[PDB]
Amino acid sequence: NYLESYASKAYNESGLGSVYSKTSTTWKTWSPDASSVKLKLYTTGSDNEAGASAIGTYDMKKDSSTGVWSLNLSGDYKNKYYTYLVTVNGTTKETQDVYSQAVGVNGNRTMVVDLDSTDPSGWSDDKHVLFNSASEAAVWEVHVRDFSVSKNSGVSEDNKGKYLAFAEGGTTLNSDTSSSAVSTGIDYLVEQGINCVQLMPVYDYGSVKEDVASSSSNRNWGYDPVNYNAPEGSYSTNPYDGNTRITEFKQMIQALHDRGISVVMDVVYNHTFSNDSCFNRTVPGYYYRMHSSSAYSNGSGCGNETASDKLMYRKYMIESVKYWAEEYHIDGFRFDLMGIHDITTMNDIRSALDGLYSDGSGKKILMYGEPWTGGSVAISDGCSQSKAGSLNPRVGMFCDSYRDAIKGSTDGSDKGFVQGNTDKAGTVANGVTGKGFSAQAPSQTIAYADAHDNLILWDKIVKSNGSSSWNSTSSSLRGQVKKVMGLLLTSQGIPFMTAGSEFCRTKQGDTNSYKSSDAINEIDWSRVKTYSDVAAYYKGLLEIRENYSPMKSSTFNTPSFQSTHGDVVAYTYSNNKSNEWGKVCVLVNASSTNDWPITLDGSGWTVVADGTTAGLKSLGTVSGNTYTVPANSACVLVQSSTFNNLKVSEKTFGTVTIKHIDDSGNVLKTSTAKYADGTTYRTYPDTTILYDYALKDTQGVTSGTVTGGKNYNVTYV
Incomplete structure (x- = not known):
């Protein structure tokens, strides 16, 4: 509890970081233990670009009761770069900026973004794409490079790998100007109508060298945060240039907003890449938990835990998550390993968002994360699944107890439900309720099967079914992925999906793929033709979900269940709206082989998915109290007497x-x-x-x- 004096006071300070106006700019930064904080300015994101000169140095002035250091200067410093030198215990360390809205290369430096000037054409009339209920999302987790960089991706050689791959107008499999009916890239998102992207971490992370092209040897997932408040440069066409990354991000945002697709951001506050990050450079031993002034704790990874407990971090989170929502119009935040944070910080970020916009729309921004720790958590108050009742109802948690029961271990061959492990079925059926752990609203439970981490769903499916990397066309295994989508997209609480699970994206059996070759980490879009039907089936479920409030209500609904054990899970949603199908029933058969006849929720149904195809158009009626779930098939039924109520246009x-x-x-x-x-x-x-x-x-x-x-x-x- 290093410095809660000088952090109860100073908590309400404002203009931390730098603030821009055409006449003058003000810097404020907090370091009560420092003997001096000195501002230093630069003209570039690094020494690579031309000139790159420093501009000058200026001592900030401490305010005793807050300890905050502040400085203000006249003149236009737009797009000037700068850093603080922090002097603590006689040491001096260069700190980038703790509040870094715009960055050089890899983050080494910050520049004073003339925020609104960066906006692309037609930005000022942009809008958020909030979801009224949190659950109406259908998060498609894409690491941007994976979606873009395949040679066959249709995306242009200069948009290949970069934010404007969400922006390249129109693109077909292997680029051919053709009846090459496989549109790819951003076009595919429109065809699927994927409704909500989650960008794998698009803030500035250190584990990719931005100085050189991203490649099979210059890849990372990016769980190495270096700046929380500035987007990654490597995905820019021009990392050396702030704004560019910002504008392209805004154009990527705007292209998704134009297409009515919400953008959710993976933000990773629980730890940082480096024990010599700015934080430790700026208030050494405050921001990181330490079992001793000699030794950090390691309850997460990489040897550190953020001092979430301690006020001048609680603020930094609160007025960062706001920042992304203020400017970039990000529509939600997914937190890595929330369990390291103190709940008394998550509750404030949630509460701080709820007041960003005067109409309260900020209440709609999604927030969730991983509740497990990454080690021996150093403090007793943690965002755990067990403590979950102390989070605000609209901060969410991944639900591993659900995940594992679907598919098994993240990593081993050990078969889960989908592959036929009957003995998970009871746990999966409970997970569909959303209360896989004690939770207060569907906004909480991130019902999920799969992630970047460990086996991508297909690789486990094939690996667990017993063979490696096969790229198999097997109508069994290819039928087997459709199980998961049948579950997740029909669970309550935010469905989730690694990008291209819907066309059996493979990483050839690679588990911790976090830096594995592009050949391991790319979407080969020819899989979209080869594993067509799968994506067509996947699209068809989003038609089902988005048009069906119970699957997407803000408060909990709750499925009935008709089987929860053995190899068939079956449950039905209920609804009262007149312009929607009424009852829905979902059945997922764990067998790879058998075709169990299931009893079902009501006396008349229309088949809307068959394990080959899905979506609003009737694939078949069925009548009487029973339905057959052939082999891998995940099938959807809706109450036939009210199938027509969904009078959406094409x-x-x-x-x-x-x-x-x-x-x-x-x-x-x-x-x-x-x-x-x-x-x-x-x-x-x-x-x-x-x-x-x-x-x-x-x-x-x-x-x-x-x-x-x-x-x-x-x-x-």
């Missing part, structure tokens, strides 16, 4: 028809973005861009709400 996609022309007509490229009926046909020059002369006025309509089956033309490039 997702009548519209189109852009970019026809880039430099001069003399002809064609330089022809994408055809497949935008949904709403959204906007925003469109971009990204062809002749490395170095070129082939350039055009970009005559055309260039932007606006799309309109259904209509062709919007821009003559870019």
Whole structure:
């Protein structure tokens, strides 16, 4: 409890970090133990770029009762870089900035972002894509590079691997201007209507060298936080340049917002990459728990725990998670290993969001994380599943007890339910209730089967079924992944999904793939054709879910169950709305082989999934009190007497028809973005861009709400 004096006071300070105005800027930073905090300025994100000079140094002034150090200067410091030197116990360490809204390369430095100036065209009229209920999400966890970088990805060679791969207008499998009906990249998200992305950690992490291209030898998942408040540079086209990463992120955000897709961010406050992070550099021995002034505790990983208990961290979280929601319009935050944090900090972040926007919309922003610790947690108050009743109802927890029962161990061959381990069935059936541990609202339980960590769902499915990496087309194993989606997307509480699980993304059996080669960590999009039907089946379930409030209500509903043990789990949702199907029944057969006849919730049903295909269009009626779940099939039934209530229109996609022309007509490229009926046909020059002369006025309509089956033309490039 190092310094709660000077942190009860100083808790309400404001303008920590730096604040921008055209005339002048103010810096404030807190270090009661320091003898001096000195501001130092730079002109670049690193010494790589041209000039990169420092600009000058300025001693901040301590405020005794708060200990906060502050400085204000006149002049425009827009896009100037800077750092603090912190002097504590006679040592001096350079601290980047504790509050770093915009960063150089890898984070080494910060620059004063003229925040609103970064905004892309048509940003000021952007909107959040909040979900009224938390559960209406369907989080598709993608690590951006994986989605983009495959050679066959259709994404342009300069958008390949980068934020604008969510922004490249229109793209087909192997790029061919063709009836190559496999649209890929951002187009696929529109076809699937994936509804909500989760970006694997897009804040600045140290475990990728941003100085060089990301590659099979320059990859990481990015669980090595270095700056919480600035997005990753490596996914920029231009990491050396702040704003760029910011704008592209805003354009990636805006492209997902345009398409009505919510963006959720994995944020990893429980630990940092380095015991010599800015935190320890700025208040050594405050921010990190320490069983001794000699020795950090290690209750998480990598040798540290953030001092969540201790006020001047509680603030930093509270007014960081707000920052991402303030600016980037991020729609939710997923916390790694919440169990390290004190609940009396999660409760404040939750409560701080609830007041960001005057209309209370901030209440809608999703928040959840992993409740388990990563080791011997150093303090007694922890975000555990057991303590869960002390979190605010709208902070959520992954539910491993559920996960493991579905699939088994994260890692071993040991078969779970999906592969036929009957003896998990009882635990999975309870997990579908959402109360796999004591929880207060569906906003809590992140019903999930799979993640980046350990075996991607397919690899375990094949590995657990008994063979390695096979890329197998087996209608058994390929039928077997559809079990999980049948469960998760029909559970209560936020469904979750590693990106491309829906086309059997494989990592060839790799467990801790955290830095494994691109050939291990890429979406080979030819799997989308090969494991078509699977994705078509997957899309069809989101049609089911998004149109079905009980699967997505804000407070708990609760399935009935008709089998919970052996090899068939079967449960039914209930509803009272008149413009929705009414009762839904979901059955998942753990067998790989057998076709058990199941009793079901009511006397008449329409089949809307069969383990091959799914979604609103009737795949078959069925009648009488029983249904058969053939082999791997995950099947969905809705009460047949009210199947018609879902009078949604078809997702009548519209189109852009970019026809880039430099001069003399002809064609330089022809994408055809497949935008949904709403959204906007925003469109971009990204062809002749490395170095070129082939350039055009970009005559055309260039932007606006799309309109259904209509062709919007821009003559870019």
